[PDB]
Amino acid sequence: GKPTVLVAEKLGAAGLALLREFANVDCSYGLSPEDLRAKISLCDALIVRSGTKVGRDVFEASGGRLRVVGRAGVGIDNVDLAAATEHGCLVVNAPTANTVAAAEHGIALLTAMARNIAQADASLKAGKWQRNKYVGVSLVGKTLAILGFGKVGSEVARRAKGLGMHVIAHDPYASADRARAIGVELVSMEEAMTTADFILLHMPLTPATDKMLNDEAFAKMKKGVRIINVARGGVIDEEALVRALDSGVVAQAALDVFTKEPPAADNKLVLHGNVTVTPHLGASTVEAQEGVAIEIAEAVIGALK
Amino acid sequence: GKPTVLVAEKLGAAGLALLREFANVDCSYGLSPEDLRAKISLCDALIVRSGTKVGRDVFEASGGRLRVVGRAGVGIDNVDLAAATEHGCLVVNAPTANTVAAAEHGIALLTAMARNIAQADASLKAGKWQRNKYVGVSLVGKTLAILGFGKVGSEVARRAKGLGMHVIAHDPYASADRARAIGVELVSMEEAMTTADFILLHMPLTPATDKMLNDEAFAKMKKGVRIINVARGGVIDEEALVRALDSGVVAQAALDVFTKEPPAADNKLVLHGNVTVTPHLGASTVEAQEGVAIEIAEAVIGALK
């Protein structure tokens, strides 16, 4: 029994060594839609991370051998998810490993924002010693607002209440009991906008969330509010955040994800003074890398059986 | 009843207005040791932050008018307590208001270093999109060793376990009950060195602690340890820290204090790739500033009664 698993995108040797113990593993890496279509007819399972677009044509082209698609990581946006099961192909993901290291990165964005770790380190490496330019805020007692109470959203909260913040969340799909059991009040969407000193974005990018943080949302906010985006860019109106920081509605902004990766080489948020930008690093911790590998590994393998 | 308080160094206008309700206040900022010896004979109280030297000659020069010296901030290194006590003079300080925004900043240095927030932000801004160079490390389950279990020491432990780390400390003058009461084991010095995935330094600088972090220290540590200093520079042999980063014993280092502030323009720690540096920003939060003003103000006024 030699099941065949095509691994389209780089994968953590920890997991590749689990798959190789339970399957044939093809690691052709980055194939053109046609190469892939040619291979998938001969694969009992496909594993992808983010770049591979498991479209409708990919299921169509397999001819019913492809049983299970393994999405390494958290999101699944790229698997045509309705074709998948229409053709009778299970789709499984690797959420919990990247989830930890992704809230970990949000918190790291929040604290480093709040004290200007980033600008200051640049200022001092550049010889300048400008102690008065980089005075930060505290976190204790500050109200943090979480939009979209996912695993990361609630894992974040848990870390932010450990830093001693008041943490609130808005997400119409959120178990009032789970929230109250970590100490998070579920609040209205206007209450979250107004009363927050800090706002993080953990929302999926749907038509209802697109360009959500636009000029109307920034008006409702408290002045002196700071904002951290670790979910998906473009859920912010990028031009509108450029204008709210230029005014002093938003005091400073911490941005992992963008509307475009790589962002424009002139793109104003990335270049702005009060912004702390990292290049979609949210799940870039060695530990998650190796634990996501092992997760879809065990996930694919358990489907396949 | 008109008391006279000489405030040598800037002070949050909150504090100044409290002091001007209960005394005459001279804000002669930055005097030469002679001008201060001249004034101190006309002053019932002297409030200083970190730069003014309350040496022995000052206590002599005042002739006994001076009743209380107020240390705006945490330590008292600059005040010759020995001489003040001798000349029947009280010393008071502003420990708690800074204490927190110190630990706060310490944590921010930790999380920003773990995830290369500083190096990555400066790269993106520099056009570079280098997603793989800047893979971070998970904090969770890691061992944070706190050398010096002061008020700031324990206060960091609190934030750390809330990020979900395994926090041990070594300070021989620490109540094992306070320690266990916040979930921190107190451990030997060789244990702190060897077991730690992270080491922060909250140690004041004695001839015992001077250049304590030395080549012999670094060999004892676990390879890939990351070191966060927010207490006093010099406790670290800079030359040896650099040689331990360049050799990869020390993974990376987040340094707020230095052996010489402002550091040398060529200083290899400041300019090093794996080092995140801030210019002694430890207490530079707007909250801890206004809060320390009002602390010594109350502290001086109460003594002065």
Author numbering:
A (entry chain B), B (entry chain A): 83 to 387
Q: Paper's wording?
A:
Here, we cloned and functionally characterized the maize (Zea mays) gene Dek20, which encodes phosphoglycerate dehydrogenase1 (PGDH1), the rate-limiting enzyme in the phosphorylated pathway of serine biosynthesis (PPSB). The first step, catalyzed by 3-phosphoglycerate dehydrogenase (PGDH), oxidizes 3-PGA into 3-phosphohydroxypyruvate (3-PHP) and is the rate-limiting reaction. The mature transcript of Dek20 features an 1,881-bp coding sequence, which encodes a protein consisting of 626 amino acids that includes 3 domains: the substrate binding domain (SBD, residues 1-179), the nucleotide-binding domain (NBD, residues 180-367), and the regulatory domain (RBD, residues 388-626). DEK20 and its mammalian homologs are classified as type I PGDH, characterized by 3 major domains: the substrate binding domain, nucleotide-binding domain, and regulatory domains.
